[PDB]
Structure formats: structure tokens, C-alpha cells
Amino acid sequence: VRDAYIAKPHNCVYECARNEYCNNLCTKNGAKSGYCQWSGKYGNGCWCIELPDNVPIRVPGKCH
Ligand SMILES: [Cl-]
């Protein structure tokens, strides 16, 4: 497991406005939970706590 921004295709974060939406998105994807980060490494986007290692996360580079 790891803590990170889960990615929607293709290498883009999931933009957000509330913690509840991210918590729902993160746990649907196997996380322990999640919240909206407005000023993290990629800026705005859902951040997930203890996401399974196989689920796609945002990595350096481009979002298509
Ligand atoms: Cl890791």
C-alpha cells in the first residue's frame, strides 16, 4: 500500500471540491480512506490513504 493521488486516465488526478467525494472514490478503489488536497504535489486532487499497490496513481509527467 501507499498514500498518493489516484489517477483517472491518463495520468491525471481526480480534481475535487470536498473530502467526502474523495473518501468515496478512494475506498471504492480499496483505500482505507481519502480526502481532497488543494495544495499538494500536483495541486488540487483526491489523495488516498493506503491505496493497494496495483491501482494507478499520478506520476511525474504529463496528464493527457
Ligand atoms: Cl511505493
UniProtKB/Swiss-Prot annotation:
Gene Ontology MF terms in the entry: sodium channel inhibitor activity; toxin activity
InterPro entries, per the entry: LCN-type_CS_alpha_beta_dom, Scorpion_toxin-like, Scorpion_toxin-like_sf, Scorpion_toxinL, Scorpion_toxinL/defensin
Main location group: secreted
Residues covered by the LCN-type CS-alpha/beta domain: 2-64
Gene Ontology cellular-component annotations: extracellular region
Keywords: Disulfide bond, Ion channel impairing toxin, Neurotoxin, Secreted, Toxin, Voltage-gated sodium channel impairing toxin
Tissue: Expressed by the venom gland.
Gene3D superfamilies associated with the record: Knottin, scorpion toxin-like
Disulphide bridges, residue numbers: C12-C63, C16-C36, C22-C46, C26-C48
Source taxon at top rank: Eukaryota
Gene Ontology process terms (BP): defense response
UniProt subcellular location: Secreted
Purpose: Alpha toxins bind voltage-independently at site-3 of sodium channels (Nav) and inhibit the inactivation of the activated channels, thereby blocking neuronal transmission. This toxin is active against both mammals and insects, and is classified as an alpha-like toxin.
Family from the record: Belongs to the long (4 C-C) scorpion toxin superfamily. Sodium channel inhibitor family. Alpha subfamily.
Domain remark text: Has the structural arrangement of an alpha-helix connected to antiparallel beta-sheets by disulfide bonds (CS-alpha/beta).
Protein name: Alpha-like toxin BmK M2
Lineage of producing organism: Eukaryota, Metazoa, Ecdysozoa, Arthropoda, Chelicerata
